[PDB]
Design a protein around this ligand. Sequence first.
Ligand SMILES: CN(C)CCOc1ccc(C2=C(c3ccc(O)cc3)[C@@H]3C[C@@H](S(=O)(=O)Oc4ccc(Br)cc4)[C@H]2O3)cc1
Ligand SMILES: CN(C)CCOc1ccc(C2=C(c3ccc(O)cc3)[C@@H]3C[C@@H](S(=O)(=O)Oc4ccc(Br)cc4)[C@H]2O3)cc1
Lengths: 215, 227
Amino acid sequence: SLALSLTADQMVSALLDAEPPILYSEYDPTRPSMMGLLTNLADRELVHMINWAKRVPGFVDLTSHDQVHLLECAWLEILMIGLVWRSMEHPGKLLFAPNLLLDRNQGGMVEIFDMLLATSSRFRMMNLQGEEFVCLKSIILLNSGKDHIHRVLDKITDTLIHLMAKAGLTLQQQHQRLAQLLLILSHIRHMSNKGMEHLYSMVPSYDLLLEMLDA
Amino acid sequence: LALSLTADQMVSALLDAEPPILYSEYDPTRPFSEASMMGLLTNLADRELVHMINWAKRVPGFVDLTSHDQVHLLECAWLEILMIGLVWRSMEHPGKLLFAPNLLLDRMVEIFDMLLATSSRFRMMNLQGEEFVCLKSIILLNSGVYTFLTLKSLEEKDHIHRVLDKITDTLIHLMAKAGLTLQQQHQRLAQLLLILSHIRHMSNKGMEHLYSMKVPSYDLLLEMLDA
Ligand SMILES: CN(C)CCOc1ccc(C2=C(c3ccc(O)cc3)[C@@H]3C[C@@H](S(=O)(=O)Oc4ccc(Br)cc4)[C@H]2O3)cc1
Ligand SMILES: CN(C)CCOc1ccc(C2=C(c3ccc(O)cc3)[C@@H]3C[C@@H](S(=O)(=O)Oc4ccc(Br)cc4)[C@H]2O3)cc1
């Protein structure tokens, strides 16, 4: 409701404020296992994601059932785009955590690793902005999982275009960049799908996410 | 040169390059079994793949790439391309999937529903044929582009993004010609491209269940391109 009256600037500021912190993996630096560190990290990241999602404009207007469905579909995509975003300044490496920086040598699992690296390289080449990044995350949340959702998605599109226009991009450059960003989301969906496979080759259930949202 | 075309030239090229609608095996044993229907769909897809290569080679910019890169794009995109074609054919048939004119099926059920929802989505958006062929070309060029390598490889990936930008210009031009406002233009462009992520999802789920007891090799795709 109120999310549909939000301006582009208000949408950006809201998403920037809802942004989760960068968490550390739990290991002792005084000491001389990887999948355990990632699992522990992803579990703590999940808690912050639920609170982030609740602060995404229009999301709370949805029924509790629809909120869970979106999170169930998007959670791995959200984690992955976050990883890719914070790894953007580290070519050839993935920054899972500030104290957990890995290259493909240490790295299902190499296939996904390379796809993650390629996305990070793509973001860096496009000079993806933080304001654009938070918009993409919100898009992933709302799109991966109907009328209200699509109105909000149109708002985020307006927000992206407004950001580009403010940055001095021409009208042609605006829709081109918009297209480039949204097409990357297809690769992110692909990575998540491949990712789920290897997670069933050893995940928050519907009830788990419902209980977290209620809290 | 694909980058020299105009929006109208691009549309005309894509429309002319459209593959034919094929028929599945005539008069199969009905009712179907799980095996017999998969046999029909497999035979149909195999014959469709032939015309897809012919189509792909006529997509502006595609033949400019090395044969190796062309195969890689097809490897990543072929199922997506088959599925969006299916979704397009099924638009005027609510609740049904038109795999072929002689194979219209109503309500692997999960993928069926995802395909129905995508078809209804295209129907609700009033997707145009001109828009459709643009989206299909985008899939071909984009689905495998994020997995390239040298200076030559840098030029290859760079060339693809330019053609992709060109198709974006073409989609926008179609929308502006239709009379849509600039706001409606950016919004509709976004809606169409977000659907491509769903098509990716259905393709991945499709690949999964295909490996589940039920894919064209590099050598096959390469040979057909050379043929
Ligand atoms: C109860 N549940 C919530 C438990 C979930 O536990 C999990 C959940 C996710 C993960 C993984 C990753 C991940 C975790 C947090 C994050 O901020 C970014 C990425 C990356 C992607 C996937 S993958 O396993 O799907 O892909 C990769 C595999 C190996 C490597 Br190296 C890189 C990626 C795997 O590595 C690991 C354990
Ligand atoms: C290249 N060759 C070596 C191998 C090709 O073999 C294949 C290739 C494709 C297919 C399938 C489909 C398909 C075929 C042609 C087409 O124009 C559109 C879709 C649909 C989607 C998938 S699915 O089996 O993954 O999804 C569905 C399942 C059931 C139903 Br009903 C509908 C979809 C399956 O049914 C089956 C066998």
